[PDB]
Design a protein around this ligand. Structure first.
Ligand SMILES: Cc1cc2nc3c(=O)[nH]c(=O)nc-3n(C[C@H](O)[C@H](O)[C@H](O)COP(=O)(O)OP(=O)(O)OC[C@H]3O[C@@H](n4cnc5c(N)ncnc54)[C@H](O)[C@@H]3O)c2cc1C
Ligand SMILES: Cc1cc2nc3c(=O)[nH]c(=O)nc-3n(C[C@H](O)[C@H](O)[C@H](O)COP(=O)(O)OP(=O)(O)OC[C@H]3O[C@@H](n4cnc5c(N)ncnc54)[C@H](O)[C@@H]3O)c2cc1C
Ligand SMILES: Nc1ccc(C(=O)O)cc1
Ligand SMILES: Nc1ccc(C(=O)O)cc1
Lengths: 394, 394
C-alpha cells in the first residue's frame, strides 16, 4: 500500500492537512486509532482566528461555517465588580474571531474528505513508524487482526498530545519546555441561550469563570477547578450555583440554566517541543505543543503549523524544492512561542493561584487595570487575541 | 517652637515639599538626622520623568537643570545579540525623560531653601512624633544635648525607608505588600564619557547590566549581582571586565574605563504600605513605598506624592477645605500601583533569576521579542517609561 504523505491522526490537524493536500494533487492517507464517532464526541474549541477561517475557505470547507458561525468583534473581561469590553475589530485594525465549535469544523472536514474519496483508515491499531531517516519511510498498523504496511515519502504526525509520532523521535534529539498549572477547567455544554452575545472572561476571588457559546441556543461555560476534582462530584446544580457566584450580579440574573449535554475537566498545561521534526517526520498541532485554553490558541496554532507544512510540501512536490522542508521548525516555533506567551499571560491574570502573597494578588489586579485601561494595553491584548499574522515563508 | 507643617527628612521629598509650600505662603520646618554633606553623598537616581521636571520648574528650582540636564528621546534594550531602540518621544506622543543626578537636584533644592531663609534643622537627633490624632500634633527632638519641641498642624513623613514616621503609625492600621528579589545592583560612578548617548538596559545570560550617565564626562554603570556579594570583593577592574562581558561586542569595544569615584550595592525590593497616612501624619516617597530601580520610578513617585500632598495642603490652608486631606492615600496609591507594576515587569524581563526552568527562560526571551517588536508593545513600555499622567484631584 503506498501514498505520498501518510497522516497519523484524524483530528482537525490531520483532516485539514489532508484536505489541503488533496486539493493540490498530493495523495495522502490518514490513519486514526479511534472511530469517526469517538472523534466527533470531543467538544473542545469554540473560538477561531481570522487566519483559520481563511484556511478553511482555502480548503473549500467553509459553507456551513459561513452560515452558522458567529463573528465576534469584541470580548469582555470582568474583574472586581466591573466588566470591560475590548473592541477587537477597532483595536486590531479590523480583524475579528469566529465562534464555531471544533466538533462542527471536524464534521465538515470529514464529510468533505468522504465526498472526495480520499483514503482514511479508522481503528488503525498499533501504528508504528519506521525508517524515519531513510529515503523511504513507512508506517505499519493493524486493521482487524492483520498487519498492513503503508509506504510513503513523508509522515505528518497529527496525533495529539498522546500520539505515537512524538514518541518515535529519539528522546535525546528533543528539548522539552513544559509548565503544569495547579488547576483545571470544569466545562459544561448546555442546550440553553448564552447569557451574552460576546464571551465573558471573569476573574473572581473564588476562581476563574468563562461564559461562551456554540450557537444561539447552545452555551458552553467553564469554571476554574482544583486538580483533585472529580467530575462525578459536580452536579449540574452545583455547577450553576458556582458559575453564578463568580459572575457580576447583572449577568448572573439573566442566566438561563439547564441540564448539561456534556460535562468534563481539562487540566491546564503549556508544552513545547523543539525541533518539531525528524528526518521525514513532521509534527503538527497538539503532537508538538500544548497551550492552556485561556487564550484559545490550541486549534489555531495547529492550523498555522498545517498551513506552513502544506505550503512547504507543495514547494517540495510541485517545485522539486525538497530542501525547504528543513525550515519547518524554525518557522512554526516563532508563532508558537508568541502564542504560548499570550496564553500564559491570559492564564496568569485571569485565574486564582494557590498560596498567592498579598503583593502578587495586588500585581494581578493591577495588570488588569493597566492593560484594560490603556489604549496601548488594549491593543496588545486584541492583536494577540485575534491572532498574529502567519509568516509567508521563502 | 511652632510651624504649620513639620517635615521629617531633607532628602528630595522633604525639600521639594518644603519649597513648594514656602512659595505658597505655608510655613514649614524640615528636620534631618544627618548632615548636609552626608545627604549630598548619596548618588542614587539619574532619570527624571517629564512631570518631575515640571514640578521642579513650578518650585522655581530648575535653572541648573535646564542648563546641565540631558533630555532623552529614546532608550535601548539589548538582548540575545541585538539592541532595540524604543523611541520614547514618538511612541508616547512627545514626552521624554531627563537625566540629571539626584545629587544635583538635591543640591539645587538645598541652595534654594537656604536663600529663602526657610528653617532646616540638621542633625536633629531622636525625632519623635506625638498626638498624631489630636488637633495639635508635635515633634520632639534633640539638638546638641537639649530636647526641643516643635508644634505643628501637620506632619509630612519624608524620611525614607528607615524613617521614624512609618514606625509611628500603629502597625495594626497598616497593610504591607512586599517582595524581595534574590539579587542586588552593583553600581559604579566614573569620571569617564558614557559609552552611549542613550541608556542601554541589557539582558545577558550572565546577568543584567545598565549603561547610564550623569553628564558628558560622567558615567554610571550597574551590573546585577547576587545577595552574598560584598563591595570590597569587587575591584574596579573586575567590574569593568564583568560589565564588558555582559554588553554587545560593538558597545564593549568603545567603552572608556576609569577609576571609580563611588562604588556600592543596592538590593532590589518592592514595598507598598496602605494607607499612607494616619491622623495628621502623611507619608511620602520612600517612607511609604519602594520600587526596584529597574523602572526608574522611585524619585519620580516621590515627586507625585509631594505634588498631591502640596495641592491638598493648599486647599486646606488657603481654601479652608481640611476634609480633602482624607483623599491623599486613595489618590497616590493609584499611581503607585501602576508604577510598582511597571518596575516589577522591567525587573522580571531584564534580570537573570536563580533556578529558572527552561520554560520560564523561554517565556522571558519571548516577552522581550514581543514587546520590542510590536508597535503596541513598544507603546506600553514607552508611556510607562516616561511616566503616566498625574491626577489633578478634586
Ligand atoms: C477545554 C478546551 C478548550 C479549548 N478551546 C480552544 C479554543 O476555543 N480555541 C483554540 O484554538 N483551541 C482550543 N483548544 C485546543 C484544541 O482543541 C486543540 O489544540 C486541537 O484539538 C488540536 O488538534 P489536533 O488535530 O492537533 O489534535 P487532536 O484533536 O488531539 O486529534 C488528534 C487525533 O489523533 C488521534 N490519535 C492519537 N494517537 C494515535 C495513534 N497512535 N494512531 C493514530 N491516531 C492516533 C487521536 O485519536 C485524535 O483523533 C481547547 C482545548 C481544550 C481541551
Ligand atoms: C540604585 C538606585 C537607583 C535609583 N535610580 C532611580 C532613578 O533613576 N529614577 C527614580 O525615579 N528613582 C530612582 N531611585 C530611587 C530614589 O533614589 C528614591 O526613591 C528617593 O531617594 C526617595 O527620596 P525620599 O526623599 O523619599 O527619601 P531619601 O532619599 O531616603 O531621604 C530621606 C531622608 O530622611 C532622612 N531621615 C531618615 N530617618 C530620619 C529620622 N528618624 N529623622 C530625621 N530625618 C531622617 C534621611 O536621612 C534622608 O535624608 C533609585 C534608588 C537607588 C538606590
Ligand atoms: N478561551 C476559550 C474560549 C472559549 C472556549 C469555548 O467556547 O469552548 C474555550 C476556550
Ligand atoms: N533605571 C535606572 C536608570 C538609571 C539609573 C541611574 O542613572 O542611576 C538608575 C536606574
Amino acid at each position: 500500500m503506498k501514498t505520498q504523505v501518510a497522516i497519523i491522526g484524524a483530528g482537525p490537524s490531520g483532516l485539514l492537512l489532508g484536505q489541503l493536500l488533496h486539493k493540490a494533487g498530493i495523495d495522502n492517507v490518514i490513519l486514526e486509532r479511534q472511530t469517526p464517532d469517538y472523534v466527533l464526541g470531543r467538544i473542545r474549541a469554540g473560538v477561531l482566528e481570522q487566519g483559520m477561517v481563511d484556511l478553511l475557505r482555502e480548503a473549500g470547507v467553509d459553507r456551513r461555517m459561513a452560515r452558522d458561525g458567529l463573528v465576534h468583534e469584541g470580548v469582555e473581561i470582568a474583574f472586581a465588580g466591573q466588566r470591560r469590553r475590548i473592541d477587537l475589530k477597532r483595536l486590531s485594525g479590523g480583524k475579528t474571531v469566529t465562534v464555531y465549535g471544533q466538533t462542527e469544523v471536524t464534521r465538515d472536514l470529514m464529510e468533505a474528505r468522504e465526498a472526495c474519496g480520499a483514503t482514511t483508515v479508522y481503528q488503525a491499531a498499533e501504528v508504528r513508524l519506521h525508517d524515519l531517516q531513510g529515503e523511504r519511510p513507512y508506517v505499519t498498523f493493524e486493521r482487524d487482526g492483520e498487519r498492513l504496511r503503508l509506504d510513503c515519502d513523508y509522515i505528518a504526525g497529527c496525533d495529539g498530545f498522546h500520539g505515537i509520532s512524538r514518541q518515535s523521535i529519539p528522546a535525546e534529539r528533543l528539548k522539552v519546555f513544559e509548565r503544569v498549572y495547579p488547576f483545571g477547567w470544569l466545562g459544561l455544554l448546555a442546550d440553553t441561550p448564552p447569557v451574552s452575545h460576546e464571551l465573558i472572561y471573569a476573574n473572581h476571588p473564588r476562581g476563574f469563570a468563562l461564559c461562551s457559546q456554540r450557537s444561539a441556543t447552545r452555551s458552553r461555560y467553564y469554571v476554574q477547578v482544583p486538580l483533585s476534582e472529580k467530575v462525578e462530584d459536580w452536579s449540574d446544580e452545583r455547577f450553576w450555583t458556582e458559575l453564578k457566584a463568580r459572575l457580576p450580579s447583572e449577568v448572573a440574573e439573566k442566566l438561563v440554566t439547564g441540564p448539561s449535554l456534556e460535562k468534563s475537566i481539562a487540566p491546564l498545561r503549556s508544552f513545547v517541543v523543539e525541533p518539531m521534526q525528524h528526518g521525514r517526520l513532521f509534527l503538527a498541532g497538539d503532537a508538538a505543543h500544548i497551550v492552556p485554553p485561556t487564550g484559545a490558541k490550541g486549534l489555531n496554532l495547529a492550523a498555522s503549523d498545517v498551513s506552513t507544512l502544506y505550503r512547504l510540501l507543495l514547494k517540495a512536490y510541485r517545485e522539486g524544492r525538497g530542501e525547504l522542508l528543513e525550515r519547518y521548525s524554525a518557522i512554526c516555533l516563532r508563532r508558537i512561542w508568541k502564542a504560548e506567551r499570550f496564553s500564559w499571560w491570559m492564564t496568569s491574570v485571569l485565574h486564582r493561584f494557590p498560596d498567592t502573597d498579598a503583593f502578587s494578588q495586588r500585581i494581578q489586579q493591577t495588570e488588569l487595570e493597566y492593560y484594560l485601561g490603556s489604549e496601548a494595553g488594549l491593543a496588545t491584548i486584541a492583536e494577540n487575541y485575534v491572532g498574529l499574522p502567519y509568516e509567508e515563508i521563502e
